Design a protein around this ligand. Structure first.
Ligand SMILES: *[C@@H]1O[C@H](CO)[C@@H](O[C@@H]2O[C@H](CO)[C@@H](O[C@@H]3O[C@H](CO[C@@H]4O[C@H](CO[C@H]5O[C@H](CO)[C@@H](O)[C@H](O)[C@@H]5O)[C@@H](O)[C@H](O)[C@@H]4O)[C@@H](O)[C@H](O[C@@H]4O[C@H](CO)[C@@H](O)[C@H](O)[C@@H]4O)[C@@H]3O)[C@H](O)[C@H]2NC(C)=O)[C@H](O)[C@H]1NC(C)=O
Ligand SMILES: *[C@@H]1O[C@H](CO)[C@@H](O)[C@H](O)[C@H]1NC(C)=O
Lengths: 339, 291, 388, 145
């Protein structure tokens, strides 16, 4: 198997392999040969291995002379064979073939997400971007894989189209995706040049900082402390910002979200998007309950009568609603005696 | 070709039994083959009607096959349906296999009043994850409270219409007379003094003070008119046991409004009292909208 | 296999075998008479006399009885059957109806049938009865075999579904399910009927189940019918992993373990195998003496002067690699020889499509190539179709 | 209310309607299910109407058909709504699939007309006409031999 570059190599990358042998009955040393799908280089000069045991030998190809650089993109079949003698008519004993995918360098692909994807609910914030360093490209297809765990399968192929105007960015939308489990994921976007087969043109995986985190919206603890319950239109209602709390009770690595507060009155606008007590866009959502802000309590006198839903909401980057807590206040000027 | 109860496929064979008849909820894999051939019998929950089949078709919604390879699957009898699992499991919330969360298929939920004198939109919340009617690998399960099936092989349980209700069973049924029994095929009307306006309810609702329900199976409560009033102080709504999802305490409201007595009158419609009118006026009849 | 139901018309079929079958050149078949006493005592009102031929021959002939006349379910019946020339297995069928659940002991008799006269016992020994196993009748089940019944019109809450479209299936949930994809949780006070998309690898047209595709087919998610993998490729379904816990959204039913997803599930047959059909299931090895490429919708024969074997040391080996067979299909399709090798000097091969005949027990017999030697006075060069 | 199409009820005082079986259909409220007419089919158990077998196919019954089957190779069916009464051949009725004529042939199962035997070409400007040996046949041979 290749070790080389951990990601698939390009035409400007050198590939270094690792290959071991092991026999459960024989012990005599054999001579190994490694051939690349280059088409121009020849089979490596036959070289012996060590004594063969049930334990696989060390990396026979670990030396610095076993390297290759491919001049064309596509699938290259790297094969390894075992003979006994170093002369040409020596009997072949075993063979093993592995594919190496070399990707295009002139095409740059990125996958951009808008908001935090929740649990089994659908997510439609993904979209892909293609930019070609050269002129007009042929048709392209894109697939998305949600996670690398076993049983998680690559999606179908979505037609992108062409990218004719050199290095301009071309955007395409990705159908709604559903995540079965919460936590960190490694979503991968692959781009090929054929609907059924063809070449793997590029792959993109978001960096460790931008990794997708599926959030569970029932684990969000919200503690809203609005002031007095049922009141009159002359009674001031207070919202204490140092006692209201927000927390994520599942993990301490969830992405940060903003908060908003609505008085449920048309005379006053809802507060602008704001972060928790001290966190910023580079922080995570705290597991321990934290005050929403350190400002003073905010007071408001209602302008009508009825039942009002003073609410506190958690929004994400795409202005979705992740969690929400409602406290109901009943305003009524019922008992007023005048003599 | 294989006989019409068996299949033969290159990539898989054998069968997996139902996990809802075991203890830990793990399908038990066996390999039963027809004697005269090598083809494996179809798994429970599937059937093979014709001869040369590579896969066993799962049974449709409303039918069931609970034994290994069968030529066709039978229809669920009235009073039972083909929802995945059993009723005591479709309703349960307490797990016994920790690594599996097995005997808790939170597939039944309902809104209602709970013991924090608080109304509760669905008592069992969360994303439903056991919603399956096609592959039924065991005996049909009894209907959940509020639903009924009157004919053989209905795909889904149907909900009781607003004026009616369906209790859990006869013993735990709320207001329901002496001879009537509940088996899952008949929605019963709401008694006088009780009403119901929602679909698929296990209990009726008590008419509040200021209103009455004179007829049977009313979708709405009638409002008392000026000159009359209803004041039933013991009328109350059923409270849902959040552990067993069964409501207990229902006391019916009023059947007819009480007219105001002589010397008293009432002018507003929805009220619980009569007001004696002041000096210079009199009321010599019972039930006067204004003396 | 032994006991019938109660108050249900039960049919006893008896099969008779005769060792020398009636000759096909016979002018007529051989007639037999089957006499059965069901063991009940309803219609004749009295059990028969001692178990002999003399009393069983008396049973009435009910061969052409219908369901209407009173003797259809009579408890002492005699039916005449005929063995046609060329045959040699026959059967007689008795309708019965057991009104109670007490134990019963039916008795059977076979006699040779002359021209409208019951002969001797057909087992050729003295009065031999065929005592069936005694049984106790059980209660008849009332289940109905058939498909689902589409419910008639009833009042339903807004959003309740009783029928789904093609590519969708009916589920029972209280969440929000638009276009087969969950978009919100707890959108209804009570569970309702929703339509959820079929998973990739399955298809449906009725909307009440998601039927997995048959072998040789594949489909994407919302498909209403599977499509066939083209000739030269077979459909290998992908292996599923069952859900870890019961609080996790499942993909399909618990008995489904392999699914054939989109067009990536069509894998090419290896070298030396071929598959011509348009919905193929297995790769067929090439016939003895033929070779094929990777696609291989067909084979080609080794030409004259060449025989079919393995070209391990040749210039262009034609055998499949480890990637094409073991990394793709597993151990089902191994690597097989599909090269054409030249005949040695002073040997000729005049026919097309010849193979080195193999030997599995190499100690006793060695593998042989079908290369004929040149006659005396003739030499030939190498891989030639004839001598000079 | 009356029973909907595809359902029936032969009893009085009931609260359900039973579904019609295969080969039968029913319109709005009816005591019994009416058998499909001759030449038309109904395969499901809730059928509100019988559909006619298309051209090239025949119904597998004279009265209550449950599946339209394709004609055999030596036969052809030109008429829609063809059925197969069981008195003659299995694949033959008054409007059902007919044998191909004496000098015509057909090989595909479901065909709406037989095709004439083509002449056999041996070279330039010479054609040997081709005939058929039997009545219903799917291949033609030179008519001289
Ligand atoms: C068990 O659980 C049941 C769950 O539903 C629950 O049923 C609900 O009960 C409540 C009452 O507790 C129903 O409330 C509805 O309120 C409306 C307004 O109530 C009063 O309105 C006054 C409006 O002012 C006018 O009238 C007053 C005098 O009445 C006059 O002074 C003014 O000048 C105005 O002219 C207001 O002042 C008061 O403060 C109150 O707010 C009523 O109008 C409703 O009447 C209903 O109308 C509905 C229309 O669709 C109809 O659906 C209902 O059947 C009914 O006719 C009603 O009183 C609430 O509707 C009801 N739920 C439903 C859906 O029916 C039970 O109460 C509970 N049982 C017990 C025993 O606890
Ligand atoms: C379900 O979701 C759709 C779109 O999100 C919405 O328009 C619809 O009103 C929802 N249905 C219910 C029952 O809330």
């Amino acid at each position: 198997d290749k070790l080389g570059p951990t990601v698939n190599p390009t035409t400007s990358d050198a590939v270094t392999f690792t290959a071991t042998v092991a026999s459960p009955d024989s012990t005599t040393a054999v001579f190994f040969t490694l051939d690349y799908g280059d088409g121009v280089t020849a089979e490596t000069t036959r070289t012996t291995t060590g004594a063969l045991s049930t334990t696989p030998t060390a990396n026979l190809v670990s030396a610095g002379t076993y390297t290759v650089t491919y001049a064309s993109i596509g699938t290259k079949f790297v094969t390894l064979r075992l003979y006994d003698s170093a002369v040409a008519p020596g009997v072949l004993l075993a063979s093993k073939t592995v594919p190496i995918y070399v990707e295009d360098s002139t095409l740059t692909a990125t996958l951009l997400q808008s908001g935090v994807p929740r649990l089994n609910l659908a997510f439609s914030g993904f979209k892909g971007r293609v930019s070609s360093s050269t002129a007009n490209r042929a048709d392209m297809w894109a697939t998305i894989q949600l996670d690398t765990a076993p049983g998680v399968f690559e999606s179908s192929r979505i037609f992108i189209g062409i990218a004719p105007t050199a290095s301009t960015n071309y955007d395409f939308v990705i159908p709604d995706q559903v995540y079965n489990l919460e936590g960190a994921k490694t979503t991968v976007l692959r781009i090929y040049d054929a609907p059924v087969g063809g070449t793997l043109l590029r792959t993109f995986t978001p960096a460790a900082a931008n990794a997708v985190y599926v959030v569970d919206p029932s684990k969000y603890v919200l503690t809203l402390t609005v002031g007095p319950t049922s009141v009159t239109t002359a009674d001031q209602v207070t919202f204490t910002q140092t006692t209201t709390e927000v927390s994520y009770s599942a993990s301490a690595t969830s992405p940060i979200l903003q908060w908003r507060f609505n008085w449920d009155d048309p005379s006053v606008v809802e507060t602008p998007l704001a972060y928790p007590d001290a966190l910023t866009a580079a922080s995570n959502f705290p597991t321990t309950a934290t005050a929403v802000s350190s400002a003073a309590a905010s007071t408001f006198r209602y302008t009508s009568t009825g039942s009002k839903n003073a609410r506190l909401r958690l929004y994400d980057g795409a202005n979705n609603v992740i969690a929400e807590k409602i406290v109901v206040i009943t305003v009524s000027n019922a008992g007023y005696t005048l003599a | 070709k294989c006989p019409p109860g068996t299949y033969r496929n290159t990539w898989f064979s054998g069968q997996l039994g139902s996990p809802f008849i075991t203890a830990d909820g793990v399908p038990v894999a066996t390999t039963l083959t027809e004697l005269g051939s090598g083809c494996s019998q179809c798994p429970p929950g599937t059937y093979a009607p014709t001869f040369g089949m590579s896969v066993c078709l799962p049974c449709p919604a409303g039918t069931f096959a609970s034994a290994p390879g069968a030529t066709a699957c039978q229809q669920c009898k009235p009073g039972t349906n083909s929802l995945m699992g059993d009723r005591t499991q479709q309703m349960a919330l307490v797990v016994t296999n920790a690594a599996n969360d097995f005997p808790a298929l939170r597939a039944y939920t309902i809104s209602g009043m709970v013991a924090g004198p608080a109304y509760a939109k669905p008592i069992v919340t969360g994303p439903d994850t056991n919603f399956f009617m096609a592959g039924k690998s065991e005996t049909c399960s009894t209907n959940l409270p509020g639903y009924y099936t009157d004919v053989d092989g209905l795909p889904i349980q149907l909900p009781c219409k607003p004026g009616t209700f369906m209790p859990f069973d006869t013993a735990t049924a709320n207001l329901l007379d002496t001879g009537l029994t509940v088996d899952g095929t008949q929605c019963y009307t709401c008694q006088t003094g009780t009403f119901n306006d929602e679909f698929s309810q296990p209990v009726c609702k008590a008419c509040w003070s200021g209103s009455f329900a004179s007829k049977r199976g009313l979708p709405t409560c009638e409002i008392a008119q000026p000159g009359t009033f209803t004041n039933v102080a013991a009328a109350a709504n059923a409270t849902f046991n959040t552990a067993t999802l069964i409501p207990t305490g229902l006391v019916k409201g009023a059947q007819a409004p009480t007219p105001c007595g002589m010397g008293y009158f009432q002018s507003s419609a929805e009220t619980t009292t009569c007001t004696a009118c002041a000096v210079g006026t009199y009321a010599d009849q019972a039930g006067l909208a204004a003396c | 296999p032994t006991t019938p139901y109660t108050n249900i018309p039960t049919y006893f079929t008896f099969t008779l075998l005769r060792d020398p079958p009636v000759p096909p050149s016979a002018s007529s078949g051989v007639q037999f008479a089957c006499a059965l006493y069901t063991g009940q005592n309803v219609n004749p009102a009295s059990a028969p006399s001692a178990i002999t031929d003399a009393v069983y021959k008396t049973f009435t002939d009910v061969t052409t009885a219908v369901a209407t006349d009173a003797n259809y379910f009579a408890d002492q019946q005699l039916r005449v059957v005929t063995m046609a020339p060329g045959t040699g297995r026959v059967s007689c069928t008795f309708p019965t109806l057991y009104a109670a659940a007490g134990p019963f002991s039916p008795k059977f008799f076979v006699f040779e049938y002359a021209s409208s006269t019951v002969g001797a016992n057909a087992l050729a020994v003295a009065d031999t009865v065929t005592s069936l196993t005694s049984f106790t009748t059980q209660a008849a089940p009332t289940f109905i075999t058939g498909p689902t019944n589409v419910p008639q019109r009833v009042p339903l809450p807004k959003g309740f579904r009783t029928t789904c479209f093609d590519g969708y299936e009916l589920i029972f949930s209280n969440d929000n399910y638009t276009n087969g994809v969950r978009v919100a949780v707890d959108a209804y006070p009570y569970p309702v009927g929703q339509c959820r998309k079929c998973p990739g690898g399955t298809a449906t047209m009725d909307g009440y189940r998601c039927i997995p595709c048959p072998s040789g087919y594949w489909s994407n998610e919302g498909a209403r019918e599977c499509t066939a993998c083209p000739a030269g490729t077979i459909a290998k379904p992908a292996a599923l992993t069952a859900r870890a816990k019961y609080s996790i959204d499942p993909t399909t039913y618990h008995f489904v373990t392999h699914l054939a997803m989109g067009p990536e599930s069509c894998k090419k047959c290896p070298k030396g195998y071929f598959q011509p059909n348009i919905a193929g299931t297995v790769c067929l090895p090439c016939p003895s003496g033929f070779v094929s490429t990777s696609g291989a919708t067909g084979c080609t024969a080794c030409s004259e002067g060449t025989y079919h074997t393995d070209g391990v040391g040749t210039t262009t080996p034609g055998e499949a690699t480890s990637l094409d067979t073991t990394d793709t299909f597993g151990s089902i399709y191994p690597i097989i020889p599909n090269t054409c090798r030249q005949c040695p000097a002073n040997t000729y091969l005049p026919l097309r499509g010849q193979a080195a005949i193999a030997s599995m027990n190499l100690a006793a017999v060695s593998s042989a190539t079908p290369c004929r030697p040149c006659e005396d006075g003739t030499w030939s060069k190498a891989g030639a179709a004839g001598c000079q | 209310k009356p029973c909907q199409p595809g359902r029936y009820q032969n009893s009085i005082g009931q609260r359900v309607c039973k579904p019609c079986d295969m080969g039968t259909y029913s319109r709005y409220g009816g005591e019994l299910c009416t058998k499909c007419p001759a030449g038309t089919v109904a395969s499901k158990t809730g059928s509100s109407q019988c559909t006619p077998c298309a051209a090239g196919f025949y119904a597998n019954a004279p009265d209550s058909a449950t599946s339209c089957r394709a004609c055999p190779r030596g036969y052809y069916g030109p008429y829609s709504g063809a059925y197969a009464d069981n008195l003659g051949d299995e694949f033959e009725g008054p409007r059902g699939c007919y044998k191909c004529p004496y000098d015509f042939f057909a090989d595909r199962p479901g065909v709406r007309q037989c095709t004439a035997c083509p002449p056999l070409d041996l070279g330039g400007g010479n054609l040997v006409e081709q005939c058929t040996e039997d009545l219903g046949s799917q291949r033609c041979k030179p008519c001289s031999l």
